[PDB]
Design a protein that fits this description.
- The structure is cut from a larger assembly and holds six copies of chain A (about 170 residues).
- The first copy, chain A, has helices spanning about 10-35, 45-70, 90-120, 125-155, 160-170.
- The first copy, chain A, is mainly alpha-helical and about 170 residues long.
- In chain A, helix 1 runs antiparallel to helix 3 and helix 3 packs antiparallel against helix 4 (about 125-155).
- The interface of A and F includes residues 2, 31, 69, 76 and 81 of A.
- The structure holds calcium ion (CA) (14 copies) and cobalt (II) ion (CO) (20 copies).
- The site of one cobalt (II) ion has 5 residues of chain A, from helix 2.
- The PDB classes it as oxidoreductase.
- The entry lists the keywords Oxidoreductase, Node, Maxi-ferritin.
- The entry is titled "Crystal Structure of the Co-bound Human Heavy-Chain Ferritin variant 122H-delta C-star".
Chain lengths: ~170, ~170, ~170, ~170, ~170, ~170
C-alpha cells in the first residue's frame, strides 16, 4: 500500500481512473468538432475556436484527476481514448447539441462518483468533486443550452446565415 | 422538461423559489430598518448605512438563487414580498436584535434546504448552499450577536449616549 | 408632529408612501423580466442585463422617495410588494411592451403626485418631482418606445433572428 | 445558551476543542523538530526552516478552529499541550517519517470530525472541515511522502551527503 | 560534550529550558485571553487583537531562547505547556490584571536567571538576558500597569461603556 | 472533391491521418510518464514537468497536422488513441530510453511521409514536413540521447542519488 493512502477505497480509485478516461474522451470529441469547423466547406472559425478551447479545458480536467489519484496514493491506469462517434458533425447547431449531450453524460458520471465517495465516507473526494467539477459542469451545460436555444431561434441549421451570424456575434 | 435539467428534484426547485422570497423579504426588512434610523427623531446615520448595506446584500443573495434556479433548469415563480413586521424599530439595540432573529430564521431555512438537497442526492445544490450561504449566515449571526452584546453592555437602549457612541465608533 | 415638518400636507405624505410602493413594484417587475431572459430556453443575456439595470434604478427611485419622506418629517409606511402580473414574459418585444406600459403607469402616478403637491401649495415637493422624476420618466418612455419600434420593424417576436440581433446590436 | 448558537451539537463543540489541542500539539512537535536540526551536531538549517514553517502553520490551524468555536457559539476549553514523544529526532529522514505519521493522525481526527458533523446534520461544520482542512492534509501528506521517498532513494539516513544535498536542493 | 560548549554551566542550561517552558506558557495564556474577547458575549475585538499579538511575541521569546540553547551547545528539553489557570477571564480589566501578574512572574524568573548567570560567571548569558529580555519585561509591565490604571479610572469592569471606549481609543 | 484540393494524393491524405494518430499517441505516452514521476513513491517533479511539457508539444504537433489536412482539402479521420505500452516506467533513465525509442519511431514515420510526398511530387507537403517536423525530431532525439548518456554516466537507475541530482540540475 502507498505510504500516503488514507481513507481511499479501491472502488473510488477505480472510478477516478474511469473518470480520467472520460475527461480525455471529451477532450478528443471537442478536438474533432473543432477541426470539423476548420474545413473549407464548413468554415466557421469561431465555432472551431470555441471547441478547441473546450478540448484544452477537458485535458486540464483529466490532468487534475490524475494529480488527485497520486495525491491520494492510488495508481493511474490509462485506457485507450476512443475516437468520437462522428467524423462529420453536420452543423454548428448539431455540434452544440452533441456537446450538450456529452457534458450531461460527463455530469452523470461525476454525480455517480460523488455518490460513491459519500457512500464510502470519503469527504475529501466528495468535496474535491463538488469544488472542482460539479459547478463547472452545471455552467457548461447551461452555456450549451443557451447556445442551442439561440441557434434554433435564429433558424439553424437550415439558415446558413443564422450560424454565420452566431459565430460572429456570440462566439467571436 | 428543460434541456439543461439534470438530477434536480421538483422539491428542490420549489424550495429554491421559497428561499428566493425569503432573501427578498430580508432585503425589505433591512430597507425598513435603514430608513427608520434616517428619521429626524432617531438620527443614527451609521445604523442607517449599516442596514442599507445589509439590504443590498440580501438582494444579491436573492439574485444568485434566481441565477441558480435557471442554471439548473428550474423555473422561477416569484411571490409577494411581505412588508416587515414593524414600521418603527424602537432603538438601535432593538433593531440589531430583530436582525439577529431574522438571520437565524434565514439560516434555519438554508439548513433545511441543504438537508433536502442531500436527501435528494443533489451534491451540486448542497455544495452551492455550503459554499455561498452557510458561512455567510454564520458570520452574519456572529456579527449581530457581537453588536447586541456591545449595545447591551454600553447601556442601550436606555442610554441615548450608548447608541450614539456605538454608531460612531463601531458602525462608522 | 415632527420638529422638521413644514408645509407638508397629510395627503402628500400618504401619496409619497404609495409612490414608494409603486417604485418598489416596478423594481420587482424588472427583476422578473431580467431572469426570464436568463432562462436556458430564452437566452437573451443583454435583454437580461437591460432589465436588471432597470430593476436597480427603480430601487434607487424608491430609496430617494424614502429619503424625501424623512426629509419632510413624514413617516414611511411600507406595504407588500406585489408579485408581477406575469411569470413568463413571452418574448423580448412583449417584455419591452410590458415595460412601456409600466413606465406610463408610473408616470401617471407621478403626474397626479405633482398635481396634488401644487394643489396643496407645496413647491418643494412639486419641484422634487419635476427635478428627479418627470424627465427621467419621459426619457424612459421614449427609450422603450424606440426599442418597441425597432423590434416590430425587425420582425419580432416571430423572427427569433430579430430579437437576437437586437440583443446584440442595441442592448449589447 | 449562546445567542448565536444554531444547529451546533454538544458533541461537535467537544470534538472541536479536542481538535484545537491536536493542532497545538502538532505545532509543538514541529517546533521541536525545527530546533533539533539547529543543533551544532545536526546542522541542517533548511530542515530547521522547513519544520519551523510547519509549526507556525499548525498554530494557524488551531487559531482558525478557535475562531470557529466562537463563531458557532461554543466555548473554548484549552488543555495542556503535551510535549512531543521524542527530544532527539535522529535524522532528517526519521523526522520526515515522524511528521508523515503525525499528519496522518491529524487527518484521521479531521475525518472523524467530518463524520460527526454529517451525523449531526451540521453542514456548516462539515463544509468548514472540507474547505479548510481536508485538502490541506492531503497535500501535506503527499509532500511528506515525496520527501521520505527522495531521502530513502538518496541513501539517507546512512549517507550524511544525501541529507545535506536534500537540505540544499529540495528544502532550500 | 558539545564541540561549541564553552563556559556554559549545567545549571544555566537547565534554567534556560525552564524559561523556554515559561515563555511558551505565557504565549498560551495570552492565546486564551485573546479568544475569550472574541466570544459573542464579550465581543471586544481590540482586546482580542492585543492579546493575540502578545501571544505571538511570547512565542518569539521562546524561540530565541531555544536558539540560544543551541548556540551555547546546550540541549533543549521541552516540557508540557500547562493550560492557563482560567477559561473565562471575566472582563478586560481582569485580563489586564492577570497579564500584569503574569509578566511580573516571567520577570522574576528572568531576574533569577540573570543572577544565576552572573554567579556562574557567564557574561554572555547575563548580557543576553539584559539585552533581549529585561527591558522588554519592564516595558511590558509598565504598559500593563498603565492599561489597568486607565480601566480602573474609567469605571471598569462595572461600566461596560468604559471597556468599550478603552477598546476603541486605547487598543484600537 | 474539395474546392481547395490541388496536387494532394489520396495516399498522402491517408498518411497524414496516420501521423495525426501517432502524434496524439506520443502525447499520451508522455502524459503517462509525467504522472508516473508525480507518484509519492517516485517523486521526481522535474522529470514529471519535463514529460508533461513534451505531452503538450506533441498535442501541438497533432493539431498542426490536422490544420494541414484541412488546408490541403483532405478530410480528417481520427482513430482511437492507444494507451501506452507501460503503466509503470520504472525509473527516470528507463523513461528517457522509452522516449528516445518513441521519438525515433515518430521520426521514421515522418521520413516515410516525406518519401511519399516526394514520390507523389507534392513539394508543399514535403517542405511542410521538412520545415516543421524533421529538425524538431532531430533535436528531440539528440536531447534525449544526451539525457540518457548523463543518467547512465551518473550511475542511474541503481543510484537514486543520480536521478535526484539530474532532476535538480538538468531538468530543473
Ligand atoms: Ca475503438
Ligand atoms: Ca462509429
Ligand atoms: Ca401582507
Ligand atoms: Ca403587522
Ligand atoms: Ca398578492
Ligand atoms: Ca396574476
Ligand atoms: Ca422647477
Ligand atoms: Ca505530559
Ligand atoms: Ca516520552
Ligand atoms: Ca463542500
Ligand atoms: Ca495540566
Ligand atoms: Ca485550574
Ligand atoms: Ca487498446
Ligand atoms: Ca500492454
Ligand atoms: Co485506504
Ligand atoms: Co467543458
Ligand atoms: Co470535463
Ligand atoms: Co449523507
Ligand atoms: Co431532473
Ligand atoms: Co445579511
Ligand atoms: Co441572505
Ligand atoms: Co406641516
Ligand atoms: Co425605469
Ligand atoms: Co421609477
Ligand atoms: Co444548537
Ligand atoms: Co502541516
Ligand atoms: Co494542522
Ligand atoms: Co562548558
Ligand atoms: Co509580553
Ligand atoms: Co516573554
Ligand atoms: Co488533388
Ligand atoms: Co517531442
Ligand atoms: Co511529435
Ligand atoms: Co527527387
Amino acid at each position: 500500500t502507498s505510504q500516503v493512502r488514507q481513507n481511499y477505497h479501491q472502488d473510488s480509485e477505480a472510478a477516478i481512473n474511469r473518470q480520467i478516461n472520460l475527461e480525455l474522451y471529451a477532450s478528443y470529441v471537442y478536438l474533432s468538432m473543432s477541426y470539423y469547423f476548420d474545413r473549407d466547406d464548413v468554415a466557421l472559425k469561431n465555432f472551431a475556436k470555441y471547441f478547441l478551447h473546450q478540448s484544452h479545458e477537458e485535458r486540464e480536467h483529466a490532468e487534475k484527476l490524475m494529480k488527485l489519484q497520486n495525491q491520494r496514493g492510488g495508481r493511474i491506469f490509462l485506457q485507450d481514448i476512443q475516437k468520437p462517434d462522428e467524423d462529420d458533425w453536420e452543423s454548428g447547431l448539431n455540434a452544440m447539441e452533441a456537446a450538450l449531450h456529452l457534458e450531461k453524460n460527463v455530469n452523470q458520471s461525476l454525480l455517480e462518483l460523488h455518490k460513491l465517495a459519500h457512500d464510502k465516507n470519503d469527504p475529501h473526494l466528495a468535496d474535491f468533486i463538488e469544488t472542482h467539477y460539479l459547478n463547472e459542469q452545471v455552467k457548461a451545460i447551461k452555456e450549451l443550452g443557451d447556445h442551442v436555444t439561440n441557434l434554433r431561434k435564429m433558424g439553424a441549421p437550415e439558415s446558413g446565415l443564422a450560424e454565420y451570424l452566431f459565430d460572429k456575434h456570440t462566439l467571436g
